[PDB]
Amino acid sequence: QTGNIADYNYKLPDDFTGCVIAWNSNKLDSKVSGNYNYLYRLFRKSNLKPFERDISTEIYQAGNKPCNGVAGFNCYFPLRSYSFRPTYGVGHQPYRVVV
Amino acid sequence: EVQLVESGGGLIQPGGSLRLSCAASGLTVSSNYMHWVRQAPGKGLEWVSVLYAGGSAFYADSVKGRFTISRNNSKNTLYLQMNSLRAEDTAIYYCARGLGDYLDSWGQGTLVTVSSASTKGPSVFPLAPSSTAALGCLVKDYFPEPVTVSWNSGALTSGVHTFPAVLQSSGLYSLSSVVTVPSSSLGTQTYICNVNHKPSNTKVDKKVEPKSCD
Amino acid sequence: EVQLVESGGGLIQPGGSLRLSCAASGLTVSSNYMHWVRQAPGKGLEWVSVLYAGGSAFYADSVKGRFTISRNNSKNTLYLQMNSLRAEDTAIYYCARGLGDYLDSWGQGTLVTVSSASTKGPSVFPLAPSSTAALGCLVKDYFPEPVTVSWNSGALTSGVHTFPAVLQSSGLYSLSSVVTVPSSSLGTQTYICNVNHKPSNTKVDKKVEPKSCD
Amino acid sequence: DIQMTQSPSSVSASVGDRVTITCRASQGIGSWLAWYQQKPGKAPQLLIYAASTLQSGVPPRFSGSGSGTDFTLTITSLQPEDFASYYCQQANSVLALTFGGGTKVEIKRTVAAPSVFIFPPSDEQLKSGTASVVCLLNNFYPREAKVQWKVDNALQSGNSQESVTEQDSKDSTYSLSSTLTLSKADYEKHKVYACEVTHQGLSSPVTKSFNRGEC
Amino acid sequence: DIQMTQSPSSVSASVGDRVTITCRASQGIGSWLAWYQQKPGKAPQLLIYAASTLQSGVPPRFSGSGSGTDFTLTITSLQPEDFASYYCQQANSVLALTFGGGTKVEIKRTVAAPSVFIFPPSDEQLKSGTASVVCLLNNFYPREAKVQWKVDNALQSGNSQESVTEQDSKDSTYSLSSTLTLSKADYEKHKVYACEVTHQGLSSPVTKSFNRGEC
Numbered sequence A: 001q002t003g004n005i006a007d008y009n010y011k012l013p014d015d016f017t018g019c020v021i022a023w024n025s026n027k028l029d030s031k032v033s034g035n036y037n038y039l040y041r042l043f044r045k046s047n048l049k050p051f052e053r054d055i056s057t058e059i060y061q062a063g064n065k066p067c068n069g070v071a072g073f074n075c076y077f078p079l080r081s082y083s084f085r086p087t088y089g090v091g092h093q094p095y096r097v098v099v
Numbered sequence B, C: 001e002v003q004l005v006e007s008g009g010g011l012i013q014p015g016g017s018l019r020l021s022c023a024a025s026g027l028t029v030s031s032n033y034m035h036w037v038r039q040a041p042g043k044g045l046e047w048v049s050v051l052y053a054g055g056s057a058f059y060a061d062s063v064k065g066r067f068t069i070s071r072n073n074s075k076n077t078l079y080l081q082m083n084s085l086r087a088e089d090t091a092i093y094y095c096a097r098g099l100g101d102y103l104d105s106w107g108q109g110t111l112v113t114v115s116s117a118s119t120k121g122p123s124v125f126p127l128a129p130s131s132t133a134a135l136g137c138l139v140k141d142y143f144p145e146p147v148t149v150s151w152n153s154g155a156l157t158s159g160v161h162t163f164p165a166v167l168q169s170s171g172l173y174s175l176s177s178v179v180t181v182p183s184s185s186l187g188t189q190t191y192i193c194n195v196n197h198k199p200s201n202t203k204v205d206k207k208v209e210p211k212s213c214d
Numbered sequence D, E: 001d002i003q004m005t006q007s008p009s010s011v012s013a014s015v016g017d018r019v020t021i022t023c024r025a026s027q028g029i030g031s032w033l034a035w036y037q038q039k040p041g042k043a044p045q046l047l048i049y050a051a052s053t054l055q056s057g058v059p060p061r062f063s064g065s066g067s068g069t070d071f072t073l074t075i076t077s078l079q080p081e082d083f084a085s086y087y088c089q090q091a092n093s094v095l096a097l098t099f100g101g102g103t104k105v106e107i108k109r110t111v112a113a114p115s116v117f118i119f120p121p122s123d124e125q126l127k128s129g130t131a132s133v134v135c136l137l138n139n140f141y142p143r144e145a146k147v148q149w150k151v152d153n154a155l156q157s158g159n160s161q162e163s164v165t166e167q168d169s170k171d172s173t174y175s176l177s178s179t180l181t182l183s184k185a186d187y188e189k190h191k192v193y194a195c196e197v198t199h200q201g202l203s204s205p206v207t208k209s210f211n212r213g214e215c
Helices: D184-188 E123-127 E184-189
Strands: A039-041 A079-081 B004-007 B010-012 B020-024 B035-039 B045-051 B057-059 B069-072 B077-080 B091-098 B103-106 B110-114 B123-127 B133-142 B160-162 B173-181 B191-197 B202-208 C004-007 C010-012 C019-024 C033-039 C045-050 C067-072 C077-082 C091-098 C103-106 C110-114 C123-127 C133-142 C148-151 C173-181 C191-197 C202-208 D005-007 D010-012 D020-024 D035-038 D070-075 D085-088 D103-106 D115-119 D130-140 D146-151 D160-164 D174-183 D192-198 D206-211 E010-012 E020-024 E035-038 E070-075 E085-088 E104-106 E117-119 E130-138 E149-151 E160-164 E175-183 E193-197
Touching (some): B004 B091, B035 B103, B045 B069, B123 B202, B133 B191, B133 B202, B133 D115, B173 B191, B173 D160, B173 D174, C019 C091, C045 C067, C045 C091, C133 C202, C133 E117, C148 C173, C173 E175, D005 D020, D070 D085, D115 D192, D115 D206, D130 D146, D146 D160, D174 D192, E070 E085, E085 E104, E117 E193, E130 E193
Parallel strands (some): B010 B110, C010 C110, D010 D103
Antiparallel strands (some): B035 B045, B035 B091, B069 B077, B091 B110, B123 B133, B160 B173, C004 C019, C019 C077, C033 C045, C067 C077, C091 C110, D020 D070, D035 D085, D115 D130, D130 D174, D146 D192, D160 D174, D192 D206, E020 E070, E117 E130, E149 E193, E160 E175
């Protein structure tokens, strides 16, 4: 299974064994003003090997012209924060998941 | 500095194969996200497909996944494969790109039409101006779209109003085209409606004059 | 209410590729059986191919399965392909349907001619009359069939008898055409024979006059 | 099965008046929201990227925000070039699938009287066994027009279809054509055919009447 | 190995006369039977569906039935429009492959006397090295048109080909022309060329002998 996060942040190999669990934590990491501590990456060139950690947050290259670290046209900041509020639906709660 | 163009669309029989092309000016096709949005006549914009980094693509729930996305970084283009046509697929195609589950730049669009039924000829019937004045030609039992009315081969462009096509109960379309002219020029100026249909390859010219016995 | 039409036939070199079209009016081609029959000049009709429900087809024993049947239910038509053409393949083609080992409705027919040899122009030789009387134009060494003979640009129609084409030992066809004319108009009205046919693109106008002596 | 709805279906306003559009979502979606302006004859353009930030090439008069399942958009200073379809697409977090029917807003025009015309079926169409009578309206505002077909002084229901043109760029007016189609048997058994038009710009209804075989 | 042959090759009958055609199968076949009318200029038409039941749009006077390997077809009341080629296709139970040579039928001309004309070869054809001599026969009946050739008062065999047209729709007659082909060297060797015609309508044979054109 692929998606926006499966092939970009944590890929599960086919020959994988173990278990994954989840629980509701809507009253722990949710504030009316908003939480900005949690960040996630969105833009990358291609998928990577499973079981690795990526720390580099260089500027994304998406056009023929180079941006050289300048946040301008045709190059945006790939890291976005999780915008969560305590007045969301049943599918928009912060869940703490351990693998 | 940024513009998108589309080409390759046109008339196609159902069950055929056609290949799309979409080139991005100044943008690399292998890096950014993509989006394809379909707008049926009388219906809103509907998403079709999205391209990921590689080896994965998601399609609509209604369709069975009859689009295959292939891209080449040599000349910065996008290629699509067409199969298993349906009468609902007759709509406009909008080449789009996405970022952060958001859409910013869209192309001008290309026309792709599926014609399962036969392409029959039209039947142009002039409307008699009863004794300003109004006159026109009634186009009925037409399968292709009305190319143009071309009142006097483009000489008359004032007062012309081409009504939108409507669906009849028999599966065909109905349309009327009219123009407002002064009543003093009814007997001096001769008006001809140029109703032609390119898909059926016919040209019909009709005479509009005040008739007798309605 | 039921009619069959054929198109796509014409002149073709041996070993060429051509597609046959046959659309059924008011009938579904994917359900009813289809039959193909040929009739070479100088002989009777001969069955060629038959259609089944799907995935199976039977051909003639003499042929080596050089027809492949492809049918699309969306367009309600039938497609035939020709490969490895021969000189014997020159025949008229009729689109047919069958039921219960019986044939009921046949189309108007299409012509496919295989020309192993090049097209030969027709030679016209006058046939001088001699005092009623009859005068004619002799057409020789022409290929292939058919040819149409008209006199005085179609003005003369009474008594005209166009003889059927016959095959010579050299492989070229022969034909004659005469008319019974009273002897009182031999010297007052001139007579011409118009020989012209499509594959040669040559028009010949030959005049025939009476010969009092030698 | 997301099942979104957009209300109202249609609304009309003039220059500088008050108008707004509301988008409702069946399930709870986060603060993400977008709006699109679909002009006929051209590809639609983006309006906003974030929940409240505006795009660089659009005027900043657009105001709209939301936190729950209800979202809205409005204009502080209306302009004549803002009359198009309004679409809402908040988020889906997996593939971005949400879109509604939309709402179209039309430019105000000065109220005048419609031009009512009637056209009998042609003699060529009579040989085909079908007769079509067209009631013609041009150069009228507002768009609403109570076109009622009168056949032998009797009301007709469920017999005609109406077509409305888009507002012209020269005078921002409408054109309406009502087409009544019938068989040759039903056309020849009635003598009087007419269409009655009721309009705001007309003090009294105006009916154009013609009779069969009127030489 | 189908091997179906129809006999006789040709027949001649008029209105009120008796005519029949017999088609036989070499191997045993069922009760299935069909007949076709093959006329030039258009696609052939069918006669019957079953062994005895006829088609909806065919004359009811066509009669034909059989049980064994011998089949036949006949017409009760003959019509001038029923003069075409006769073909038989009984059954094959796998692919329906059976057909015969065919049989043609024509209309009398009260045994009219033939008009025997001769055409010495044109001078243009003589320049090419080939001479063609045509003996013309027209408005004659029946098929017994002897076009035996005489050159220098000597008989010939195997040098001419005969062609017969279809019967006309106005007077229903025959038309035969036979071309004698010889080389230029062989044409100049002899001087007298003749064709004699023996016919039922002629008491004595008529020979249109020529030494020069006419003179």
